[PDB]
């Protein structure tokens, strides 16, 4: 049993809810929240901007030190940093950004990072401002992640379309 409430069950391991991911993290304090990161960990907008704002910019300060030491992530890659006031840990995952021309086949590699964690609160990778089709992102999620994932969909309209169209 876990703390997640109000989710629709899609599969054995994947759950979905219409929710602001910043508000869900604050309520649950999950072990892992996933950030929709870029390779520079520049948390300017979208999920990243919202998560970072909720940490009062402490996520960005920590991230800048990580990049200064390690250099940029890979598209499809990830790193584990603090969850600050939102979670124990933040898994920063880089899905491909279609608005930068990145290979959508890297979306599966991105989701494979989730398999290193038994339970996660996450957004749909490469969705929102990243430019990919969220229906496709949900399909890749279900067909890639084997650990227990609780997906937070920001738009109510999109949430209802993802559920209604789910095979
Ligand atoms: O695209 C999203 O899921 C998103 C974008 C910005 C803020 C939030 Cl809470 C969510």
UniProtKB/Swiss-Prot annotation:
Known catalytic reactions: Thiol-dependent hydrolysis of ester, thioester, amide, peptide and isopeptide bonds formed by the C-terminal Gly of ubiquitin (a 76-residue protein attached to proteins as an intracellular targeting signal)
Activity modulation: Inhibited in vitro by GRL-0617.
Superkingdom, taxonomy of origin: Viruses
Subcellular location: Host endoplasmic reticulum membrane
Bilayer topology: Multi-pass membrane protein
Annotated Macro domain residues: 1-167
Function, as annotated: Responsible for the cleavages located at the N-terminus of the replicase polyprotein. Participates together with nsp4 in the assembly of virally-induced cytoplasmic double-membrane vesicles necessary for viral replication. Antagonizes innate immune induction of type I interferon by blocking the phosphorylation, dimerization and subsequent nuclear translocation of host IRF3. Also prevents host NF-kappa-B signaling. In addition, PL-PRO possesses a deubiquitinating/deISGylating activity and processes both 'Lys-48'- and 'Lys-63'-linked polyubiquitin chains from cellular substrates.
Assembly and oligomerization: May form homohexamers. Interacts with N protein.
Protein's UniProt name: Papain-like protease nsp3
Source organism per UniProt: Severe acute respiratory syndrome coronavirus 2 (2019-nCoV)
């Amino acid at each position: 049993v876990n703390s997640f409430s109000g989710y629709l069950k899609l599969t054995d391991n994947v759950y979905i809810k219409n929710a602001d991911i910043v508000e869900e993290a604050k309520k649950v304090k999950p072990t892992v929240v996933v950030n929709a990161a870029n390779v520079y960990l520049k948390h300017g907008g979208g999920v990243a901007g919202a998560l970072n704002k909720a940490t009062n910019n402490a996520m960005q300060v920590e991230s800048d030190d990580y990049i200064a030491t390690n250099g940029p992530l890979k598209v499809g890659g990830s790193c584990v940093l603090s969850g600050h006031n939102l979670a124990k840990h933040c898994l920063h995952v880089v899905g491909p950004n279609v608005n930068k021309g990145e290979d959508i086949q890297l979306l599966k590699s991105a989701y494979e990072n989730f398999n290193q964690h038994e339970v996660l609160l996450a957004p749909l990778l490469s969705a929102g401002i990243f430019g990919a089709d969220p229906i496709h992102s949900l399909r890749v999620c279900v067909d890639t992640v084997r650990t227990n994932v609780y997906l937070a969909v920001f738009d109510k309209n999109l949430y209802d379309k993802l559920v209604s169209s789910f095979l």
